[PDB]
Design a protein around this ligand. Structure first.
Ligand code: NAD
Ligand code: NAD
Ligand code: A1L22
Ligand code: A1L22
Lengths: 292, 290
């Protein structure tokens, strides 16, 4: 039976490290770090996630505010707010929760965050630098997926990894970290990485996952991954968070079935989710210090 | 037996499209495109490739100058030259031929070229836009590999593709173009892409290539791809240019000629496509589409 990695427990520990680093940063006489999250509209999952981000900020001693705006806001109005916060010396970290309404262009919003306050890693310069293996602010969820693999001791070099999903904020950066060179400014995992997505036929996904030592599913599809596609002893990291039915929450992985064939497994909830919040706190203290 | 895709004949068409577009662009009153190439030192393959580049520019109506500097040049002096060209209103496309001598930070040189003149697609903003599937200058060898696949009509959507190599300038953008979404600003190939590299064991490479509808080799290793790794009928695209003793790619051409459906020769395969797509990017830059 597979070891269930608690993302809740790993995240909680990482927050402690961030907390220690913050009180030391403050005791050295620097300003306490402040994080500003802009929330647009009323997606319920967005409000949970932002709520968890602001709770972790309190836990790690970072000041925070959530600024909620209605979905009917215009792109100029959001840009004005972002520019205002870009210019508030008290604001070290600034993120806009995604997704945004169809009339707001995400990339223009993401690029409008001052790159030094870009705790999301979503600004195009930050994406370029990550894709060139330079020093960069890493996006939280992919960096959380990496920390689960690293802090658990699961090896990546020369190993087979399948990522199901290619979103620019989740699947693509995960795939970029795991396959890239360990020797570069920002090291990578030196793994052999298969990117699959909505046009991968389910029979072809199986033909690759069977080869895999790590399967990372970020597709948003319940039971996408099941025990017959999983090689024995392999690590399965479930990035999906899907609302199904009374209302429940699952990942992409058939947790119970894969449990019996994986060597490692991530639950949903309490897996990759809490790790995203933790790495965001790390990015905020990194941004407050002005290291990049 | 395996169709041998002619790199020279496809680039001929692409180049004719460009001469057409440049002539229309000039006739309607605009300035003729100008491409500046900076070349450092005396790598004989570099001078060959630059010469091929300016030869192709001349036949498609694009003016061009090669600027040669010695290997002993200093990074500060190259930065001067690049900044002067960024501000020369005649220069539409500017590119610095790689590799650069070991004492020069290639990344810092690439980011020095202004992105609107970055016909290589190597400035960090162009790398990021490409990785976001946005309108960008695509790098010439990656775009050439794509054009070979599209214009030969080899399907990619839903197909297994392996790329051997992860270099930021060739292997990585090939993998990016091929796995990405056909419906985005810059479309991709919607394939299932495996990225292999130097720490991939051969057994695991072969276990992934026997599944591959398209194998793309950009590793710079002679005889890497052999017929036992290739499934019957699959397309094999040889990006590597290896000076063995002669000039050959990564593939075992004669052997894989028997198992593959399609194959590309070295030379005369991807090589000419790189020169062809650089011509596309130069007319794109002159139009200031971005
Ligand atoms: N911290 C966390 O755990 C966290 C945070 C955010 C999102 N998520 C989840 O992780 C994923 C992130 O992706 P997103 O929501 O940004 O992307 P998205 O919703 O825009 O697209 C999802 C991706 O799934 C892929 N996909 C769809 N069907 C597939 C199939 N049959 N096989 C393989 N791939 C398939 C798509 O091609 C696409 O790349 C989603 O599943 C989301 O629920 C998790
Ligand atoms: N330099 C040029 O002008 C030019 C032009 C077109 C094509 N190419 C070819 O493309 C290659 C890549 O371009 P570059 O020079 O920027 O890259 P590079 O020389 O930095 O490295 C090439 C790649 O090969 C990979 N590799 C090494 N051993 C491997 C193995 N056993 N299996 C799979 N992959 C392996 C490496 O991990 C690396 O990513 C070149 O070596 C060259 O032959 C070069
Ligand atoms: N700008 C921007 N926009 C974005 N969208 C993201 N991504 C993001 O925020 N992801 C995210 C996902 C899950 C969770 C979390 O807290 N997970 C808990 C369950 C809690 C719960 N509450 N209700 N249901 N579940 C769990 O998985 O156990 C926190 C954050 C970003 O990073 N930056
Ligand atoms: N900034 C920058 N720097 C770079 N280094 C590159 N890469 C690059 O230019 N690659 C490249 C490789 C081959 C050829 C070519 O012409 N191949 C022919 C001739 C064979 C031959 N050789 N000698 N005799 N015959 C063939 O393969 O058929 C053209 C370009 C770049 O794109 N931008």
């Amino acid at each position: 039976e597979a070891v269930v990695i608690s993302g809740r427990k790993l995240a909680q520990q990482i927050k402690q490290e961030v907390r220690q680093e913050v009180e030391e940063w403050v005791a050295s006489g620097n300003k306490r770090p402040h994080l500003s999250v802009i929330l647009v509209g009323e997606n319920p999952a967005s409000h949970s996630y932002v709520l968890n981000k602001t709770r972790a900020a309190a836990v790690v001693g970072i000041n925070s505010e959530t600024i909620m705006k209605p979905a009917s806001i215009s792109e100029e109005e959001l840009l004005n707010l972002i520019n205002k916060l870009n210019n508030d010396d008290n604001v070290d970290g600034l993120l806009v929760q995604l997704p945004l309404p169809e009339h707001i262009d995400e990339r223009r919003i993401c690029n409008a965050v001052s790159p030094d306050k870009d705790v999301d890693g979503f600004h195009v310069i930050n994406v370029g630098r990550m894709c060139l293996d330079q020093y960069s602010m890493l996006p939280a969820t992919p960096w959380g997926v990496w920390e689960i693999i690293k802090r658990t001791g699961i090896p990546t070099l020369g190993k087979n990894v399948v990522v199901a999903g290619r979103s620019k904020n989740v699947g693509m950066p995960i795939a970029m970290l795991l396959h890239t060179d360990g020797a570069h400014e920002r090291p990578g995992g030196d793994a052999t990485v298969t990117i699959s997505h909505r046009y991968t036929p389910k029979e072809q996904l199986k033909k690759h996952t069977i080869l895999a030592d790590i399967v990372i599913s970020a597709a948003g599809i319940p039971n996408l991954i099941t025990a017959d596609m999983i090689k024995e002893g392999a690590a399965v990291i479930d990035v999906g968070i899907n609302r199904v039915h009374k209302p429940k929450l699952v990942g992409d992985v058939d947790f119970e079935g894969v449990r019996q064939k994986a060597g490692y497994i991530t639950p949903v909830p309490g897996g990759v989710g809490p790790m995203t919040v933790a790495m965001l706190m790390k990015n905020t203290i990194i941004a407050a210090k002005k290291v990049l």
